[PDB]
């Protein structure tokens, strides 16, 4: 049937079954989908202070809108965020429908970084307010030569604590300056949960060699029950959002109890999905004799949205027909807690 | 009888039962009311706001109490001159649903609200959880064969969910009664509706006004579970505003306050889509052409869970889940056509 | 496999499994705890508030940690004299659930809260998502056969959903311990309970106190997806309040603040209904006649999704969806009878 | 799977799918858009060109973006007085297709073109290959029943294929907007249309204007492979021309230049035929009798192959060949009747 | 049936069949289980005296409670235990239910290292006294690059001689200082049995290359007969326990004939299981031109316990139902003496 391609994309995020996947449950009567993808080379960094004497690169793949991947202790992170935000780098989906634009609220002039405490406005540029994740996957390949392919990795999926300050907003293209913004997992989660986490005790935890990580594939799991959409609400902020104050330009709620913090958390995250945390114990990188482990990151976030009539995409929307196999497809998918499976 | 419930679900004006429900077993004890109103509507002769324009703009939204807003209406021109797009509203007065505005400190009922003084929007329905079983609109042109020209175009759409797109106004369509309901805000036309490319929306249709009596407009639900809407307590000051004139149409001052989002959530069944209609009517200039006369028949079938303090709580019955509910919903919403035959 | 889960769903006190679930596959990885408590309750001898009254008022609510509130109990009269309707609370101390009040600036645990100074209600469970698999109360008249007179009446109702109808108090029923849960507020009796004509409510039943040992009260879930509740971070200054006395029962200071709605949403499983019970007991004069003594047995089967930091995360198991879940829920909630044969 | 595609093929206004295709597997990766427009058209009141004439001449052509040209319409009389036969154009503004006139040396967009200075007609779609899945026109007499008199006649014909029979004008029907499409040139009426004895043409039909609401005009494709059209880069100086007036209707200055043939080939899907319609309307004297007012509804379902630079490239889907394509096309084109029952 | 997951964990210690495995024989009427796991990077050390001129790392995986793995001649062992206790390192299960706490008996104040000869008390902190091993496995992966993956290994399982001084107590987390204690195989076993053992003569002995050890999986074998639980008895000691006197803080019975020695041996070891001894003939490590072989150790000990009513875990206990396939599952498992099998 026609739902076969949708189910295939549901269980295999990188599947080539269809360019316009859907969750065939009939929730979004008329909707369109985009397969957001990005491929980036990532290398563990040589940090002077924050990750001094550490060859561990920390990866969080989260169901956030636009910037699902956060990497701490990457060379790009050390370059772009020196000593700030855990020297992290972000992989997002620039030049694709989703995203926001920061404006000065009083005048409407786009502005990045935000000039807080002055009033700001995150303008939703996607032409949609309801969105959900069909499936989200990450593929990591060790791109070093055979004489430098040493190291290992550990990974586990987990139930996120839903703390507003665990998510942040950063440019979709991974820079610190472009005013096309997405929602990313905050590096603050690493130093409050991630670094101290007892990974081995999490169900589904797995480990392996970096030279074999190219055979692994990490994907988030949805619920077996109906996958409710996330509603993007209007968002304006003054001092209710904050950053480290440095050139990293990673902004997150100033606290966890304000109404803005909860609104930001709810609108920026698909809370039907789980999170995955990966530690890459890489080849050392000191810049003189060891130059770290270079990786190939391939992240795909399949998203279904309901476009509003003002959008030019509203003409392309198609009908979402409910299928009888959707629930059992999802249950079969999420009945295995293994953090990764073979490609 | 699940068959009668399904019949009402797919045909809002069906007479299968007087107590329809969504037979999914979500609300354990509940009671439903089929809110209805019949109103005559004519495109207005506005001096400035719609000067020279023969288009009457109709929005049918899944709001509690006042589903229909009509801009460039003769009633709108008379009641709300030069304000709120000279709109008129069709609601459900004298039926259980509704609110009453009070001055919060003293408790004195007060309409229009005395902003910035603290106000309270008291829920008078005796319920806090509500949902829409089905909503329908029927329009008939009431002109003679010598005056029955014109055409219409309509489409359903996914609403952008902006708090200022909804407003609160008297249920009976007046500006003073103080039996308030939630309506689509005429400000939606100024920002989305007027400049909207209707022809590009899926399910868009057009037709002649003389043939609109054979059409029927209904909102479409989701195929999945139809979650109910919760009415929260509502007190406000400067967080709500209006045009400041005698139109007495009030709405959130901005789109970002907590009150704005609470108002949006509680006033709208966000499981249902919206429909927009443009009526290209006979000109109404006041001297040589006197417009198109319409009969509007709007029905909103609502299911609520009454609280024990209500004088309707004793009449609640059980909601029994039926197997065919999802199939009925999917069959209903699989066709995006804005209207069908009656 | 899922038969034990269904058994616990329909029978809260069933011995089928120590780790029940709602087998719908909603929480992929989750663990469950069967929160239970057995207490002895007798009607009190109030000097002023319930002076001369022989009625104990019991509310069974789907609140996290302290589901039962008893007004005009001996323990209520002793611990909370002339305050909060001299009510007692039955909670689940020493088990996983609960909060801890802190001074926000320093993090030092502190009970009672030092209003209006900034307080933080730290969630001490390792979970943020929780839902009630099933909740039930058993009441046993422990009086001698010679003193078995009296009668009771009960009803289930759709809850007002007002923030001030819920409160926070120590889990162990005291006023001093800094392990806090969420309880139905005795203010609900003042506003709704006392003035309710219970006999009119659907599913209302009455019986003799000597036959209450054969009855079982249990809340009714929905037939649709039992969506979980999210515990949000909570910090309060003047947004919470109390009677000002030593009863230390704290609740939102109004029904409209952001904290009020957050508290109400996070503390209550809104997929369940509430139960109100009136116990008409033997009089308690304090010296010679000690009224009626009961055995209260309340069980709240809760499913939670533990976060990584929790030591319980290692024990979580996979929730597999079962085909009979909807049928079981609908069969359970299709009967509005407030109690069924034990 | 392909049933929806066949439905759109035989019924241009069908609601089967928002992304139709010709399922022949010609374009491996492609996306489709259903270009539609609904306009009100009434016969004009010309001072000189159509002075005293009640006939509107309508050409439905397979031109990219502006398929319909109406001569002697009120809008034509207003926008293009005494020029280009006082014609109106119905195009598809704001949708993907269209061009932009530039000054060739600087690249600055400029409309009208500054002949004889070098101009460039930049293709603003992200595609170079395009073909028409199906094209149809619906005409509705919007006059009152009292004023429903008049008749119409129509025929389909094999097109001359002369470059000056096509022109470029703004997509939105204006004379000033710099979003350009390809339209049938009103010069074709002067050379062919006006002097045509329509009654002799095969498939010719006539009817009453009051019954045109029951008719549907659609172009007929071939039964063989529907080969796509290629949009070539186009730069022109004196090779294009206009009447010299404010109507801004531009067409090749002769029929033999390389640019003339390139323009003709790239702007027209030559696998389709054309349709000529004569509407004999009520007279329009400009003050008391306003002639006949129609509702024009034209849909052009187009399949394109987007190039990598386009943002639409990500949305392209695989065109799978179907066994029923040839049968569907042959069944469609085997009937030369100019219109069929709506 | 439901016993399928239990049998799967019985035969595959790293199986993801269930998070709460059991031995479905109906011995422990009401019980709860924990899957104790730890993942540690291990490298053969460069010792100056004890393992001078030796590239052999000695691994013993024993059915001891909490610290099943002992590695001699590891870099961590050379660092933490210089010249003492065979320069060994231990992989245990910290932060998981099992373990002990050392106290001064007279005052009850926790104290590590013990201040012997003064009276000490090993306080059982698990909330249980009856325990048994469902299954125990070890996975070793060579984490060197392809230009440093030289070496080989040999392994054999054996029947332990049950000498009390062959086991010891050491912190669960592998340090020498944390007061959360477990039971480990004593390095003294190596110099009395292990170093001189004729490994090739033991049935089931196998050998291979270090670059292929990642395909091997070592697991202990239980008896085919009923798996009796081990009872943890109260334990207090003065001079009946001893160490080398150095900063290694590895403590073991002072002799083999005291009542305390036998009690320690019986309570700390599941004597229904066999032992495995592995020799890793690693790449040389001299600190100037060869830096040894780096490994990834992944050890899992699946344990079933009966919690006492004072424990908070007593509420979570489930019923142990006897299954008809348990005996044949165990017999099929232990009928092959091969020291390792493919993963």
Author numbering:
A (entry chain A), E (entry chain A): 46 to 388
B (entry chain C), C (entry chain B), D (entry chain B): 47 to 388
What does the primary publication say about this deposited structure?
One major group, the Bacilladnaviridae family of single-stranded DNA viruses, infects diatoms in marine environments. The icosahedral capsid of bacilladnaviruses is formed by T = 3 asymmetrical units, in contrast to the smaller T = 1 capsids found in other Cressdnaviricota groups, presumably reflecting the need to package larger genomes. In contrast, the CPs are highly variable and thought to have been acquired from different RNA viruses through multiple independent horizontal gene transfer (HGT) events.
The final reconstruction reached a resolution of 2.2 Å, with local resolutions ranging from 1.82 to 35 Å. The ClorDNAV capsid has T = 3 symmetry and consists of 180 CP protomers. The asymmetric unit contains three quasi-equivalent CP subunits, designated A, B, and C, following the nomenclature previously established for CtenDNAV-II. The three CP subunits are nearly identical and adopt a canonical jelly-roll fold composed of eight β-strands arranged into two antiparallel β-sheets (BIDG and CHEF).
